[PDB]
Structures are given as C-alpha cells and as structure tokens.
Amino acid sequence: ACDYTCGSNCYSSSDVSTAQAAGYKLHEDGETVGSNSYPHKYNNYEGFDFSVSSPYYAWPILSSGDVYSGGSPGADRVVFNENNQLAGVITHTGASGNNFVECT
Numbered sequence: 001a002c003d004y005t006c007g008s009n010c011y012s013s014s015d016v017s018t019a020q021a022a023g024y025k026l027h028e029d030g031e032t033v034g035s036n037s038y039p040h041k042y043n044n045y046e047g048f049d050f051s052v053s054s055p056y057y058a059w060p061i062l063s064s065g066d067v068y069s070g071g072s073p074g075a076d077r078v079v080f081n082e083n084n085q086l087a088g089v090i091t092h093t094g095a096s097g098n099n100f101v102e103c104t
C-alpha cells in the first residue's frame, strides 16, 4: 500500500516501521553507516509540526525496499526521536538546495 508518497516513491506503514527500527538500533549503539553518517540529528530547520518531542534523528528509507547499509541514501528519510516514536517521513524531492518537504 502507498501510505506515504515522497516524490514518486511510495512507502507502506511496514516499510516505515522497518526502516525506523534499523535506524534506532544504530542510534542506540552509537554507530553510523555511510559517508554522510546516518542516523544523524535532524534539526527541523524547516519547522515541521511533528507531534513527538525533539531531539530528532534522520535515517534513509529506500524505494528498493532494502534497509540502508551505506551506499546511496536517496532523498528520503524516516525521522524518529530518542524515545523511538516516529515523527514523520521527509524527502529532499520537490524542495530546492538541501531543503526538505514532508511526504504526504
């Protein structure tokens, strides 16, 4: 099912729970993967109205269905907090520069 669309990529609630679980376990272990070092803090410069407390972390979510393991992160991210509550799914597709737009 298409529960969120980021650009032309569709992701399901399960796709999002899977991606977040991976991201949170690395957060907890205090290790990172890939050159841009994920998970990394999400600052919320954009000011999205998340309904979970900060701080937030971003972890890539991929349209191929695989869990990020370094390599190309694409434009999409699952965002979660320190308590492992999901905050939102965001993407760089449809925004200029390094900005983000929320997946809908």
Ligand SMILES: Nc1nc2c(ncn2[C@@H]2O[C@H](CO)[C@@H](O)[C@H]2OP(=O)(O)O)c(=O)[nH]1
Pocket (backbone or CB within 6 Å): 036, 041, 042, 043, 044, 045, 046, 058, 077, 098, 099, 100
């Ligand atoms: N637009 C934007 N980027 C952020 C924020 N917090 C961290 N970043 C990361 O900061 C980078 C630019 O300095 C953005 O591409 C993005 O990287 P990632 O997409 O790899 O997660 C934020 O609040 N807004």
Ligand code: NA
Pocket (backbone or CB within 6 Å): 009, 061, 062, 063, 064, 073, 074, 075, 076
């Ligand atoms: Na992708």
